[PDB]
Amino acid sequence: RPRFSFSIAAREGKARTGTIEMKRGVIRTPAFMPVGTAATVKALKPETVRATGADIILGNTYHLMLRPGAERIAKLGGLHSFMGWDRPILTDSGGFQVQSEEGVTFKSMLSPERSIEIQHLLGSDIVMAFDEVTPYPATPSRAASSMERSMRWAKRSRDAFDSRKEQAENAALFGIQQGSVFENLRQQSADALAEIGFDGYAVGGLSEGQDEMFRVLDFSVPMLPDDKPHYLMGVGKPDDIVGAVERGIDMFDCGQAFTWDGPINIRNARFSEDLKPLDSECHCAVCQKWSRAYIHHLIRAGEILGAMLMTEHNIAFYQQLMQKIRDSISEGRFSQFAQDFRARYFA
Amino acid sequence: RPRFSFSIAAREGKARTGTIEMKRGVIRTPAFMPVGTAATVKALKPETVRATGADIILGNTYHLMLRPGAERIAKLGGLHSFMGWDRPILTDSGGFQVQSEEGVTFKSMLSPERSIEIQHLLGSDIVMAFDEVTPYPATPSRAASSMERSMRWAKRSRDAFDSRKEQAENAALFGIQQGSVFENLRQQSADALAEIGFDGYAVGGLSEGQDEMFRVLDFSVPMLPDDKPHYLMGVGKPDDIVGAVERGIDMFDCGQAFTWDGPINIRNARFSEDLKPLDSECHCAVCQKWSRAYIHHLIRAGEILGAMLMTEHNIAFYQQLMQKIRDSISEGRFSQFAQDFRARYFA
Ligand SMILES: CC(C)(C)OC(=O)NCc1c[nH]c2nc(N)[nH]c(=O)c12
Ligand SMILES: CC(C)(C)OC(=O)NCc1c[nH]c2nc(N)[nH]c(=O)c12
Ligand SMILES: [Zn+2]
Ligand SMILES: [Zn+2]
């Protein structure tokens, strides 16, 4: 396998389905990435993460640099080895969880250079440029100043990554579009990132309300290079994913249980004697073996197994959603799927 | 399979190894029973419990009657179905976790009759008689009065169980010896229980210090019927198990990680960069896949996966201990095993 190759197999309107091939594995797109906050996907063994269908997970640079530490993880062999996940890992840059033109110092430093270095020490497969994330709402002046700094930092990120031969040869680098909700700033940002050149392009700064997010995506995603993956950071509700895919997004990150009829809160007393599985159609191991009543009990009792079973179901639901999206786009029936999904999820 | 059959395959001194056959499965003795406090073995799926070698688990009548409730579990199909463990389950009576000759009332009633009924509603395979547990230390007068009440309650337990045909036909009933540390009271209690007749006999009221416990076991276990299982309640340190087996016990219940060189506390900073598994010889899935350094990180970070991995290792260590005990007794080399175990565990 190559360092990085994105192939589009099928399209429907702005929606795409395809594959990212990398040295550690293939990523089916559109993709949902479980989040491994402190070198673990909460309450799941990596083998269980994989069994839900996940092709890639996300690691948080901010949290790992604080505990257990990036240099420590490198000395122990890198994040993949440390946590026992051997497939691709995307790391964020830290711009959300964390000031001057050099970078930021904080109490528990980060800069374009140090962020890229940390992601190298972790052994990330997909590295994110270090950005300045613009609060919402933002005045046009502030959004502009902030986007411009982020594009300067994107070039510094690019140069840092490229200066590290092992990283340049084995990992990919994504740039992050900024500009708040303003079309001209999003265009300027897209142009700047494309001039620098990246392996993929994230839409940052969103996640305001859904209508507003979708309006910004309507004009922002077509600005990005068509032939590279489009990653919407920080957006994970099922409905938000469906509409973002309809607007050209390829990648997403991560008592409430998801069902095809909408979310339920399993702690509600109505579930105390309900022998049905969490969802009627879900193929996951939890829905095969345990009732709503049992999981209700476990979560109300504070038992770790309740967290384990709820998280495995929810991740498996997300991966089933992504599979249904991929198949419907490849079959040219994604519009119909989106309509059917919503009429039931919100019935 | 029969309702209940205990067979002794091999002996060495007072130690025995054999099998209890029951309708839901075979129990290899000497046996260690993981504890399922609120209808779950902490942080483990039942399939993971089984993969460690466990043949039987323990459920706590006190806790289940409070949450989710015994009548509720029966309406949902019984404890086996509710939690997804299809092998034997032993339930305690509640005499430890919880006054008059009728029973006890408390704030979050129990009596011999209601305890047996609760265990029936849960669908327990091995039911414990309801006892009065004697505090330690106890004066001879108090220990005697208390033991006598427990023997009256043992007869009421026997009569309650037998009056329930489905329970009598499908479950087993164990009696509990009392008498504190006094040889004459332990003898009186053994005699009373044998006159009533049970499928197995527990030594209650112990777990004071190890020397004292072992002295009491020296004279108390030979008093119990030889041809039935001997269960020491509430005693679970590895050293305590080895010496209790040497005195004729067959059954036991459940940051610290067990190793063959002694326990370690994985939170200690000395483990922060230790790439070795928890134990050098352990065959468990955790020791095959993850380092001390990773588990150190997880436990210090409060992550659920740390609890999951520590518990699976510890239970697997206990089951490996029990297997080594069983094999050594069957091979007539248990004395040597006990000596070798201690010289290393305490090196
Ligand atoms: C809170 C607001 C709406 C201002 O930003 C976002 O929602 N931002 C989304 C986001 C999530 N993770 C990110 N990592 C980086 N590097 N940059 C980002 O913009 C983001
Ligand atoms: C605290 C002292 C030493 C007084 O008792 C014990 O250690 N007792 C051990 C024990 C554990 N679980 C039990 N369940 C019941 N029904 N009866 C018991 O005696 C016990
Ligand atoms: Zn499910
Ligand atoms: Zn182990």
Q: Where do the domains of chain B lie?
A: 1-347
Please answer yes or no on whether B82 and A294 come within 8 Å at the CB atom: yes
Tell me the one-letter amino acid at A327. D
Determine the Cα–Cα distance for residues B114 and B120; give it in Å rounded to an integer: 10
Residue pair A40/A64 in contact by the 8 Å Cβ criterion: no
Specify whether the CB–CB gap between A258 and A267 falls below 8 A: no
User: Which ligand has the shortest distance to the CA of A240?
Assistant: 1
How distant, in Å, are the alpha carbons of A92, A120, A164, A195, B143 from that of A167? Answer: 15, 6, 5, 21, 73
Q: Do A273 and B72 touch (CB under 8 A)?
A: yes
Residues 6+ apart with CB under 8 A from A123: A74, A78, A79, A80, A81, A89
Q: Which atom of ligand 1 lies closest to the CA of A93?
A: 16
Task: Looking at the complex, report in whole angstroms how far the Cα of residue B273 sits from the nearest Cα belonging to chain A.
Answer: 7
CB A33 within 8 A of CB A50: no
Contact at 8 Å (CB) between B182 and B143? Answer: yes
Residues forming beta bridges with residue A203, ordered by sequence position: A177, A232
Smallest CA-to-CA distance from A115 within A101, A100, A94, A99 is with A94
Ligand (nearest to CA of B33): 2
Residue from A297, A312, A315 whose CB has the most chain B CBs within 10 Å, to mutate: A297
Q: Phi then psi for A263, rounded to 5 degrees?
A: -70, 150
Experimental method: X-ray
Tell the burial category of B269 from Cβ atoms under 10 Å away from its Cβ (0-12, 13-18, 19+): exposed
Residues 6+ apart with CB under 8 A from A162: A168
Please give the Cα distance from B295 to B317 (Å, whole number): 16
For residue B150, what are its two tokens?
């427990």
Write the CA distances from B315 to A303, A336, B167, B307, B327, integer angstroms.
Answer: 18, 50, 30, 12, 18
Q: How far is CA A22 from CA A7, A54, A88, A90, B327, in A?
A: 12, 15, 7, 12, 49
HSE-up of residue A218 (Cα within 13 Å, Cβ side): 9
Instruction: Compute the distance between CA of residue A41 and CA of residue A35 in angstroms, rounded to an integer.
Output: 6
Cα angle A176, A180, A181 (rounded to 5 degrees) comes to: 125
Smallest Cβ–Cβ distance between A83 and the set B45, B294, B304 belongs to: B294
Task: Give the type of residue at A131.
Answer: D
The two tokens of residue B305 are 């996966």
Instruction: Give the number of the ligand closest to the Cα of residue B278.
Output: 4
Q: What SS3 class is residue A296? A: helix
The number of residues making up chain A comes to: 347
User: Does B68 reach chain A within 8 Å, measured CB to CB?
Assistant: yes
Residue B307 CA to residue B318 CA, distance in Å, equals 16
A233 Cβ inside 6 Å of ligand 1? yes
CA A235 to ligand 1 centroid distance, Å: 9
List B175's β-bridge partners, or say none. B201
In angstroms, the Cα distances linking A139 to A49, A99, B153, B177, B200 are 41, 19, 78, 78, 78
A273 touches B: beta carbon within 8 Å: yes
| Residue that is written with structure tokens 């309702």 in the block | B3
Q: Topology of domain A1-347, per CATH?
A: TIM Barrel (3.20.20)
What span, in angstroms and rounded, lies between the C-alpha atoms of B23 and B3? 6
Ligand 1 atom nearest A130 alpha carbon: 16
Cβ atoms of A178 and A147 closer than 8 Å: yes
Nearest to B40 among A68, A84, A303 (CB): A303
Residues of A in contact with B45 (CB under 8 A): 305, 308
Q: Any residues with Cβ below 6 Å from ligand 2, and which? A: B 92-93, 95-96, 128, 131, 133-136, 176, 204-207, 233-234
